[PDB]
């Protein structure tokens, strides 16, 4: 990374002004005579004692244990930005009642208790409690700062320069900031995207964490520089409770974290907009996930194929190359769902076009992939070549849908097609236009098996300040680029996802990968960690990066398998396939200057280990799909830190070399060259874990040193769970999606287990519009395995049947009996390994749509 291209806090005048305020007595005070209490909110005027600026505090109790704080000017010269399209609904409120009052304080009860809010008038402060337990304070360090809007026209407050880029800053200083105290909290997480540790560091002696969507070339590790996406959500965990803070601001934001009986203080500082913050009071982390999901929505249910393996590079040369790659997977018995087409596929980086030499017949190429039951992904960026012969440019220029400069002209910058303009994705008509451009009549050469990749949507501008858009560019409604920056990418993602839904008549689920993102981006598809590097430490950082994203609702995360920059040695490429095979978005990708690394180009030993990793992933597709359905319905992360599952185990709070998938699998991928073993922490008092390869049982809590070879992927199934698999690995997921299921039952020490399974057609909205799906619950206790409906609304005509049950931790029965309505009682044959206590039940033969029971006699 070239750090001189990106501002430190001292170089961002508003960060420098805000951060120069140190702890002390706040000059703000609430004017209790102006207090008004209604059923939805409490409003009170606040005043700055020196400048006499009046602000309005809108305080609300909300259903699901949340509190909302909104602060804005009472009489502004012009309106302040309020973030649109991120909240999925107007949050249901909870009545605040005065239960206490004196000349400097008002105590408010939320609904019928137990939550209470204490408003102190002088200095202005808010305390949030549950009964007698102090959960958090607001403005306890007196760091609240609301720069009021001055008459439009010290150093850098107004006109400001960074390198040679000038910000005319017509509205002058307008930054807002506020501090929060978390007594009892020593561990905080979230606020992606940073190439840094899962457990966030204190920022006291260095830079605050920065949230400003930026294209950072050759980004480095373990630092707080802003990367491509921004989710202004911070989680706090302790043995006793979970809390969350959601700071709804789209402007450049800096976050300071400090420690101090134990307590963590958080300070947020944003360039413009209002103070709009949600306090998510838990008490469990699952309660925080539900709280946040009620505000910003849940993960969009990926079409099944998008959870398979993706093969990409910058670039496949032409149609012949794409078809050779397709054939290479089949000739080497390696599954793959999608082959990707980077920027060289288009006509000179004119998006929605095809190079007439390289891709003269895209429909024929797509038909060939469709005959292999595979898909393709085409890159479409939000920058349009300035070319009068390019229809997209002419329509957007003619309709005035580009982002403008202050003088009213269309902004033109440098990007991949040379001179390019930037569509104003904040304008709803622009998003409608973009969505309609994906119709099969408009996007010539596209077909239903063509999906989309949105890159450079920060937006990336080569000659702009910090490689992005000028702060004083103008958007829809007259808002400045500074006001909206962090939602520009989200709007690109939203409009592309809508385009894929609309072109199909509203039937097909979209698949869109996006580089830039914000709160709510989980609703539109997948994200990835950008341009990582082919190095061991970048393989390791993929875990804390995707975990930081999972915690804040972005479950469909991944990092480029093999690293984007440079050439990975074969061992590193194998280990990356193993890591990627257990991460939500699984794509091999590589930079333009790299050697080819399609997996069959390596020596046989490496090919075999990669094939094994691909087979493991493909067999787990019913499990991945079920976790994603759970994320879609509940807002629960797919990929999880161990502390989410073991909240009282303090030794798990910083773990980032291991992770869990749902509640059932614990993964410790090998991430060092030449490793012959791994240290695995298996938590849980009275918990057991099964090594999924050897079936060896291990009791928790323990740190085990496990031996590994090149083909090893340290994976453990938790006792008490049932994992569904497709054991017949075929060339793509479409090939497997009607196949029989094998149930892997890992018995707890009490001899019990449970697990769920979601199934549908694999790609439409029929699960929601027609309730065409199945949600099954498998449960084991005593000597009986049962399948029952977990959602009776769901029905599905399917040939899927249960071909096998593998039971880990079971003794040898004398007989095995299957009962299902509509059939005579059946006797199943079985095989039992006394050394591992593994019981295999042969061919139950029952439909997955039916209730049934298997009794071990």
């Amino acid at each position: 990374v070239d750090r001189s291209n990106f501002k430190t806090c001292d170089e961002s005048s508003f960060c420098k002004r805000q951060r120069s305020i140190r702890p002390g007595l706040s000059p703000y005070r609430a004017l209790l005579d102006t207090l008004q209490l209604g059923p939805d909110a409490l409003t009170v005027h606040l005043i700055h004692e020196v400048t006499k600026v009046l602000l309005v505090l809108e305080l609300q109790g909300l259903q699901k244990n949340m509190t909302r704080i909104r602060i804005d000017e009472l009489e502004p010269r012009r309106p302040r930005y309020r973030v649109p399209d991120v909240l999925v609904a107007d949050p249901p409120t909870a009545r605040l009642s005065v239960s206490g009052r004196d000349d400097n304080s008002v105590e408010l009860t939320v609904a019928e208790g137990p939550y209470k809010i204490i408003l102190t008038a002088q200095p202005f402060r808010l305390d949030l409690l549950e009964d007698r337990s102090l959960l958090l304070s607001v403005n306890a360090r007196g760091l609240m700062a609301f720069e009021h809007q001055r008459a439009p026209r010290e150093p850098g407050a107004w006109e400001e320069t960074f390198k040679t880029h000038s910000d005319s800053k017509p509205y002058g200083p307008t930054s807002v900031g506020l501090d929060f105290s978390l007594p009892g909290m020593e561990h905080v997480y979230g606020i992606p995207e940073h190439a840094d540790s899962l457990r966030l560091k204190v920022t006291e002696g260095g830079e605050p964490y920065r949230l400003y969507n930026l294209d950072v070339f050759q980004y480095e590790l373990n630092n707080p520089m802003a990367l491509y996406g921004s989710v202004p959500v911070l989680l706090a965990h302790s043995f006793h409770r979970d809390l969350g803070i959601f700071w709804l601001n789209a402007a450049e934001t800096w976050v300071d974290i400090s420690s101090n009986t134990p307590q963590t203080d958080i300070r947020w500082m944003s360039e413009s907009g209002i103070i709009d913050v949600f306090l998510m009071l838990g008490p469990s982390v699952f309660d925080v996930f539900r709280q946040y999901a009620s505000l910003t929505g849940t993960q969009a249910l990926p079409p099944l194929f998008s959870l398979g393996y993706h093969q990409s590079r910058w670039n496949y040369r032409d149609e012949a190359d794409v078809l050779e790659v397709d054939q290479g997977f089949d000739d080497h018995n390696m599954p793959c769902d999608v082959i990707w087409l980077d920027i060289e596929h288009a006509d000179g980086k004119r998006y929605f076009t095809w190079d007439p030499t390289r891709f003269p017949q895209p429909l024929n190429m797509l038909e060939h992939l469709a005959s292999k039951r595979r898909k393709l992904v085409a890159i479409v960026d939000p920058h349009i070549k300035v070319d009068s012969g390019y229809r997209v440019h002419e329509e957007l220029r003619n309709h005035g849908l580009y982002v403008k400069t202050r003088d009213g002209s269309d902004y033109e910058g440098w990007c991949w097609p040379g001179s390019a303009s930037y569509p104003d994705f904040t304008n709803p008509r622009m998003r409608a236009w973009w969505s309609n451009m994906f119709s099969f009549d408009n996007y010539e050469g596209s077909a239903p098996n063509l999906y989309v990749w949105n890159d450079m949507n920060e937006p990336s501008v080569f000659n702009g300040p910090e490689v992005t858009m000028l702060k004083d560019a103008v958007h829809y409604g007259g808002w400045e680029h500074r006001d909206i920056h962090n939602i520009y990418g989200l709007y690109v993602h939203m409009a592309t996802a809508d385009g894929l839904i609309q072109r199909s008549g509203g039937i097909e689920r979209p698949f869109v990968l996006s580089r830039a993102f914000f709160s709510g981006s989980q609703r539109f598809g997948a994200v990835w960690t950008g341009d990582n590097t082919a190095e061991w430490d970048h393989l390791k950082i993929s875990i804390p990066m995707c975990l930081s994203l999972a915690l804040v609702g972005l479950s469909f995360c991944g990092a480029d398998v093999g690293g984007f920059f440079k050439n990975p040695e074969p061992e590193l490429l194998v280990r990356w396939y193993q890591m990627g095979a257990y991460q939500p978005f699984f794509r091999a990708h590589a930079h333009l200057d790299t050697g080819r690394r399609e997996p069959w180009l390596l020596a046989s030993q490496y090919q075999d280990a990669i094939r094994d990793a691909l087979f493991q992933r493909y067999s787990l597709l019913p499990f991945w799909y079920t976790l994603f359905y759970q994320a879609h319905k509940e807002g629960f992360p797919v990929m999880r830190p161990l502390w989410v599952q073991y909240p009282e185990d303090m030794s798990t709070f910083s773990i980032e070399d291991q992770f869990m998938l749902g509640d059932a699998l614990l993964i410790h991928p090998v991430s060092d060259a030449g490793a012959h073993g791994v240290q695995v922490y298996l938590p849980g008092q009275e918990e057991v874990w099964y090594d999924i390869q050897s079936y060896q049982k291990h009791h928790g809590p323990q740190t085990l040193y496990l031996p590994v070879t090149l083909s090893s992927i340290p994976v453990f199934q938790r006792g008490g769970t049932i994992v569904p698999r497709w054991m017949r690995v075929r060339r793509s997921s479409d090939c497997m999606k009607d196949d029989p299921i094998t149930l892997f039952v890992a018995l707890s020490p009490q001899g019990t287990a449970q697990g769920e399974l979601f199934l549908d057609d694999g790609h439409t909205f029929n699960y929601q519009t027609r309730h065409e799906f199945l949600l099954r619950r498998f449960s084991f206790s005593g000597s009986t395995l049962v399948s029952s409906s977990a959602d009776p609304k769901g029905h599905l005509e399917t040939p899927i049947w249960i071909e096998r049950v593998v039971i880990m931790g079971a003794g040898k029965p004398a007989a095995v009996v299957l009962q299902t309505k509509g059939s005579p009682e059946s006797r199943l044959s079985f095989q039992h390994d006394p050394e591992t206590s593994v019981l295999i039940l042969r061919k139950p033969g029952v439909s997955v749509a039916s209730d049934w029971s298997i009794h071990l006699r």
């Binding site: 018995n333 005959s371 292999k372 039951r373 054991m727 017949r728 690995v729 075929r730 060339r731 479409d734 090939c735 196949d739 029989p740 071909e803 096998r804 042969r842 061919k843």
Partner: protein, 88 residues
């Protein structure tokens, strides 16, 4: 009075099974020899007879996968995909 037929024995000797476990869509032999006609074994093989032209063997996992692997189309017999003869 009535002489019974002998059971099937896997080509690798790992098991002896009734002939109703041959092509019964469940893998009973470690070598895949009980399932030449189905996708049930991970290491089985399906024979493309390709009547009139060169015969070919394909992976079992390509039986009823919805993809046309044999030029005679016999690998796709219960998948929904109807393959055309392309052996010529």
């Amino acid at each position: 009075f009535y002489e019974e037929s002998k059971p099937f024995t896997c080509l690798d000797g790992t098991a002896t099974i009734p002939f109703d476990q041959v092509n019964d869509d469940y893998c009973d032999c470690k070598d895949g020899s009980d399932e030449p006609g189905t996708a049930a074994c991970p290491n089985g093989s399906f024979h493309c007879t390709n009547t009139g032209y060169k015969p070919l063997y394909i992976l079992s996992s390509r039986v009823n996968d919805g993809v046309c692997d044999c030029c005679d189309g016999t690998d796709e017999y219960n998948s929904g995909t109807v393959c055309e003869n392309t052996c010529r």
